[PDB]
Ligand binder design. Structure first.
Ligand SMILES: NC(=O)C1=CN([C@@H]2O[C@H](COP(=O)(O)OP(=O)(O)OC[C@H]3O[C@@H](n4cnc5c(N)ncnc54)[C@H](OP(=O)(O)O)[C@@H]3O)[C@@H](O)[C@H]2O)C=CC1
Ligand SMILES: NC(=O)C1=CN([C@@H]2O[C@H](COP(=O)(O)OP(=O)(O)OC[C@H]3O[C@@H](n4cnc5c(N)ncnc54)[C@H](OP(=O)(O)O)[C@@H]3O)[C@@H](O)[C@H]2O)C=CC1
Ligand SMILES: CC(=O)N(O)CCCP(=O)(O)O
Ligand SMILES: CC(=O)N(O)CCCP(=O)(O)O
Ligand SMILES: [Mg+2]
Ligand SMILES: [Mg+2]
Lengths: 396, 396
């Protein structure tokens, strides 16, 4: 029986993780948990799973303790902030860490888990997009089991030769691999015209037709910046250069991604769209874990389609590939700019079409440099956020 | 550099094997080869690949030597019959045996290769359908590397957990597997009406829309007895009971077959329809072998469809499942009946619709018994051939 620390338990990924862990209390206990604003959901979670430690930002500690007071919930240690996130992500008594915080805020805890040699289920893709080879080299230097939860990357992991982890990291495919096809749903506005793209509303962006998710990844999916981020993520996780990864639009989102081989083989992972599958896989790897996700029924889902992405209508993809080829702090700049642009759009301060625009501007305005350390990364991230906020405010 | 004995080199599989081996003369040399009627094609093959030994039936030896005389081809040992087939399939100097003979005639050589502990590339599916657990137990008892060449079974092999070979053979899936989906093109007459089914001609049966193959497997594909045989084959190769294998019609024949997992995962192998891919895989496993098969392009092959087989319109499928559940000598009876029924149809002695009919009759007429030995199997095969020939002759 292994202990789990869930970072961002109240979110979409956190809740799918809770489902799986609740089906297997004999294999997994919950030791630590973190939330950022959904405090009463967190209290109910605490009742059901009785963690030893919980974390919230400082400006919520009070509101949480008062709640714990009502339910007469005692015995739960309460820590605050990024510092509590790191402490629980690298805790002596934790065995597995689900990194399900959203965006850059998850970088320090996640990396911490990596440096403590935990089994790290990487859902927070932004952390890897920011830290790249630092996080990967740290996983290797501390024997951290860094397993992908992002559905495409889990699909690729499952479609690679089984010991691909221990292969020569050279940027070049290995062991017969020749290409990776990174599937994409194309977002809810795949077939929208530029006219309606210009006037998309937040509610529309957030309603994904296949996956029920948080707002940030919903928008990124509508915008195809999610797929840009996932291209960067795949390049780091599997240590491959970007021009070996090909994006494929697949509206049904039943095939999750593909690996192609030098003998003409293409291996795939597919299934009903339910993050519980890849969560269970990463959690139990190398063992398979029973879940309640129904078996894929191809008589009901009897058609699958594919097509090339429209990188003129969704320029975020070429921006991400850009950052990747540039390397260094380019993915960090991109990620920070996109974070505050998505934020500004969700707050109806900017139009949908403007989201990539601010990203591009930031990337053209702020200059790149080597990703030498986490300090440098956080620094460049702050500066990119500033540049992007300024550009925004100058367009209304 | 390893030596290869190709059984049935002149056929479709034999020629794809020749393509691959010709691209890699530094890794593979051809030591032995066999043909049954295409003698001058065989002589040209001998020129190009210079085997040490060739085999043909006795009633062709003369015709071959005369040919060798013309070209002044010497140094090639000539053996005759099933006995020469066994001798070359188990030869001290052979390392790999491609079992690409068609039908029951390939049983003794193939099994021989298995008993000599060679790496056996199993294309001749009839041999396994006949001999089942005898052949599998012999592969295990002699450490024969028995690798599937049949495209669906190669796809499944690639989609299983990687050490599935060493798992507990119990008829029950293992290591998280929950189902196998055995894809089927549905044949050229998938959407034909019973009226036109009744008057299908041999030329029509033989023209497969995806794969260029021999006549027997072409007919079996039109008839869906190929898929019956492949259900039996899968059950033996992966040691699973039949009710875990689900047939899926997939007209584009781009997905080759699938394995489903208890976490909701489905793993797949897909690619352009070219037997060179699975041949190369089985030949080089566990290493990947470069081939000239073009990479699968999902922008060109941009649609995939699936549907349930019509086992009322193609009753050969339920007949095969029948034989499998019955066990013992039931697959042998089925296979022999189908062999001479397909033969009679190709010789315009019977109508297409009659093919399964004779099979069924034979299975109802001849009684089952345990598959105790190869002797018993050959015996029951002869008796089934006799029963089927009699039934045929009694319908014109
Ligand atoms: N949801 C999905 O299906 C998929 C998501 N992912 C990745 O998983 C990560 C989270 O996904 P998702 O569940 O959709 O997002 P959510 O918004 O639903 O959840 C985010 C979680 O992080 C916490 N959080 C939010 N902001 C902060 C902050 N400054 N500091 C600390 N914690 C914070 C939230 O707490 P609270 O709820 O209390 O505000 C919440 O627990 C993301 O990186 C996403 O890209 C990957 C592929 C699939
Ligand atoms: N072709 C394909 O794409 C696929 C075929 N397979 C399997 O591979 C096997 C052969 O396939 P295929 O190439 O299509 O069939 P073919 O008819 O094209 O070739 C059969 C081979 O076996 C030889 N042969 C035929 N009859 C006899 C006999 N009594 N005794 C000894 N040898 C004989 C042929 O010699 P000759 O040419 O001189 O007459 C020929 O070399 C079959 O079991 C088939 O089911 C599996 C899946 C794909
Ligand atoms: C399930 C998953 O892994 N996602 O990243 C959700 C978005 C899928 P897409 O970006 O719309 O293809
Ligand atoms: C390529 C292969 O493995 N075959 O058995 C050919 C027939 C394919 P189907 O039986 O028509 O699906
Ligand atoms: Mg994803
Ligand atoms: Mg086949």
């Amino acid at each position: 029986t292994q202990s789990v620390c869930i970072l961002g338990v109240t979110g979409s990924i956190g809740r799918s993780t809770l489902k799986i862990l609740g089906q297997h209390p004999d294999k997994y206990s919950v030791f630590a948990v973190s939330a950022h604003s959904r405090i009463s959901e967190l209290v109910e979670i605490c009742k059901q799973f009785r963690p030893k430690v919980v974390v919230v930002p400082e400006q919520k500690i009070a509101e949480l303790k008062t709640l714990f007071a009502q339910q007469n919930i005692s015995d739960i240690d309460v820590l605050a902030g990024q510092e509590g996130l790191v402490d629980i992500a690298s805790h002596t008594d934790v065995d597995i860490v689900m990194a399900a915080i959203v965006g850059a805020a998850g970088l320090l805890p996640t990396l911490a888990a990596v440096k403590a040699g935990k089994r790290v289920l990487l859902a927070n893709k932004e952390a890897l997009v920011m830290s790249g080879e630092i996080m990967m080299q740290a996983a290797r230097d501390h024997q951290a089991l860094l397993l992908p939860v992002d559905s495409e990357h889990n699909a690729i992991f499952q479609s690679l030769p089984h010991n691909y982890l221990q292969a020569d990291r050279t940027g070049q495919p290995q062991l017969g691999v020749s290409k990776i096809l990174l599937t994409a749903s194309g977002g809810p506005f795949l077939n929208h015209s530029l006219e309606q793209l210009v006037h998309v509303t937040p509610q529309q962006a957030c309603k994904h037709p296949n996956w029920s998710m948080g707002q940030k990844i919903s928008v990124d999916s509508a915008t195809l910046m999610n797929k840009g981020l996932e291209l960067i993520e795949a390049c780091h996780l599997f240590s491959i250069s970007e021009h070996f990864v090909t994006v494929v639009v697949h509206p049904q989102s039943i095939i999750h991604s593909m690996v192609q081989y030098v003998d003409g083989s293409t291996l795939a992972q597919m299934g009903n769209p339910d993050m519980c599958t890849p969560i269970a896989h990463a959690l139990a790897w190398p063992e398979r874990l029973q879940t309640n996700v129904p078996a894929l029924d191809l008589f009901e889902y009897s058609q699958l389609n594919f097509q090339a992405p429209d990188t003129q209508k969704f320029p975020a993809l070429n921006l991400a590939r850009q950052a990747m080829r540039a390397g260094g702090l380019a993915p960090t700049i991109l990620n920070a700019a996109n974070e505050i642009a998505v934020e500004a759009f969700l707050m109806e301060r900017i139009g949908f079409t403007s989201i990539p625009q601010v990203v591009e501007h930031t990337l053209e305005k702020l200059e790149n440099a080597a990703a030498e350390s986490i300090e440098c990364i956080l620094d460049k991230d702050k500066v990119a956020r500033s540049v992007a906020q300024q550009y925004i405010s100058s367009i209304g």
